[PDB]
Design a protein around this ligand. Structure first.
Ligand SMILES: C[C@@H](Nc1nc2c(cnn2C2CCCC2)c(=O)[nH]1)C(=O)N1CC[C@H](F)C1
Ligand SMILES: C[C@@H](Nc1nc2c(cnn2C2CCCC2)c(=O)[nH]1)C(=O)N1CC[C@H](F)C1
Ligand SMILES: [Mg+2]
Ligand SMILES: [Mg+2]
Ligand SMILES: [Zn+2]
Ligand SMILES: [Zn+2]
Lengths: 322, 322
């Protein structure tokens, strides 16, 4: 049953929203609500019907991978929606910037194949050869994003003038490309430097803030409730094993964190929560104090839980080895 | 024709080479000779039969556009060859670096359509949407170069280890992407920054020098003798007029420097020589003083010759005025 209850629309605004509850049509409708509710339909004369066909286009072009699937895209877009409200971003950003933040979130892993950059490059694929080993998947995601938008029936921007299309497009590209974890250190070091004296009337500081926001949402699964978050780790590792199978039986290098024999659910997250998630949301909390209690808080609770799980896993491996 | 005379082999080593005398047959055999003579076939275990097939395929993947054709390809690699000897590059650069320089120069405009990046982006071409407005032609040149090299019958790198291939791929990519003239000032400023106190054991200083070197060869046509240089100006304007005419009938922006109402042969070369070519070769001359007499001298004469021809143009216009 598409058509959402008023209870659902309420829940949808917070990062506690149970993303697993809903089937695709309900998620499409949830996303459709977001565009209306943020005033993007109103302020960019988006045809209400074109909006629905666009979300169906997008959905069709996400794949049935275990992790990089349409449900991931909904998580990231819904988490961006939560962040608009939590941080009150309509006070600091234009409606163009919100449109970029939302449309980039929805489009940022379009047609992900289930194998990451390092596979693409080492196997010398169609995509690595096409994009010269430079963020190949991330370029592919934008390419597909705008190939969808070039179809008149899927074009939510059809009544935006050329200058505004040009600005959105640039913005969307900057953000979708920023999702490549290869650049996490570079992007964070850029941001932290700008943060020494932040200025919202500085376009360059704001371009970085948006980059950090989409990144925050992209890797945001562990910010959610333990019940909601925990199943994404199986989805990740299942996808990661799929690749490291292929890498072994093709003789390509294998990343320790994708190695069946090495990684566990617990050791996948301890490091990620501690040295990627926590520091990123720590920096962002300076700019938005309310982030601490809502987002940084479940990250401490997740860190503490996954370190306990490791103590039990490790204790259990003392029984196994011969 | 093919089977090059000892005289042709000697004249091929210098910037004075009459690039117009030779049909595709002979230019290929020349390029081939360059690889044997520079010790690239020897030092990289290149199969000389594969070398011939690669070159035929490269040549096949250049288009019959007025300016950006196989002959332009030949000029850039031939000018690179000249510079190797003039600047004694084998005393400063590794054989791997020479391989990167020659192979990049040959490959740098593969499958160029005859309309520049500004066309691609304003007409929203497959290429522009594919490459996210980011140097769409240059990325595509690289893409075509390594599609070709992925075919085993065209693969001149087939006996190089993977480590070496990765290093060459990366190097060629940097160079080909450096030929986008939109980055000329950025690249020159980055080069000039290092040039304050240059260092050949600094790998980044070298990476820029190689970017400058291919840039020099890419736009070097005015360095060649005045009989050889001048018909290339007609080829250029023919291509640019072909684009400005399309831009006019398609309702797209037109660039003054490409307008067939506004631009003369002389106005097309004066600014370009005085403010792009000359300062670039001036900066190279500091590192290689011998460049002044052999390359900056013909540029000076061409500037003078074209500045005089504008004074003729301008006085003929004053008689026209009624
Ligand atoms: C085992 C892996 N753990 C991990 N990776 C994630 C999450 C979300 N997204 N991702 C990647 C990165 C973006 C796409 C999928 C997450 O909750 N945990 C890790 O530590 N790393 C660190 C390097 C790499 F980012 C994965
Ligand atoms: C009229 C044009 N003149 C010009 N352009 C050239 C030459 C060689 N290569 N090129 C371009 C560089 C990339 C494509 C071919 C040359 O001898 N003269 C100009 O003034 N400009 C201003 C900058 C723009 F690149 C061309
Ligand atoms: Mg991704
Ligand atoms: Mg070019
Ligand atoms: Zn993602
Ligand atoms: Zn060129």
């Amino acid at each position: 049953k598409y058509l959402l209850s008023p209870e659902t629309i309420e829940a949808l605004r917070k990062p506690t929203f149970d993303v697993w509850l809903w089937e695709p049509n309900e998620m499409l409708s949830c996303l459709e609500h977001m565009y209306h509710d943020l005033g993007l339909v109103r302020d960019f004369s988006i045809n209400p019907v074109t909006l629905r066909r666009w979300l169906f286009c997008v959905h069709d072009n996400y794949r049935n991978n275990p992790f990089h699937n349409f449900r991931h895209c909904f998580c990231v877009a819904q988490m961006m929606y939560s962040m608009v409200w939590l941080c009150s971003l309509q006070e600091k950003f234009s409606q163009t910037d919100i449109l970029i933040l939302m449309t980039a979130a929805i489009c940022h892993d379009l047609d992900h194949p289930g194998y990451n950059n390092t596979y693409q490059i080492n196997a010398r694929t169609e995509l690595a050869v096409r994009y010269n080993d430079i963020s190949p998947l991330e370029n592919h995601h934008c390419a597909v994003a705008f190939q969808i938008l070039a179809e008149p029936e899927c074009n939510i921007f059809s009544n935006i003038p050329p200058d505004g299309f040009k600005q959105i497009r640039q913005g969307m590209i900057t953000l979708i490309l920023a999702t490549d974890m290869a650049r996490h250190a570079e992007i964070m070091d850029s941001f932290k430097e700008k943060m020494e004296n932040f200025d919202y009337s500085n376009e360059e500081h704001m371009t970085l803030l948006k980059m950090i926001l989409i990144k925050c949402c992209d890797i945001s699964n562990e910010v959610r409730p333990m019940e909601v978050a925990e199943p994404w780790v199986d989805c990740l590792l299942e996808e990661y094993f799929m690749q490291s199978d292929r890498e072994k039986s093709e003789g390509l290098p294998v990343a320790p964190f994708m190695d069946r024999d090495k990684v566990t659910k617990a050791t996948a997250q301890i490091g990620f929560i501690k040295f990627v998630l926590i520091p990123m949301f720590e920096t962002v909390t300076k700019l938005f104090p309310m982030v601490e209690e809502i987002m940084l808080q479940p990250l401490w609770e997740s860190r503490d839980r996954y370190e306990e799980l490791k103590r039990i896993d490790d204790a259990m491996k003392e029984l196994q080895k011969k």
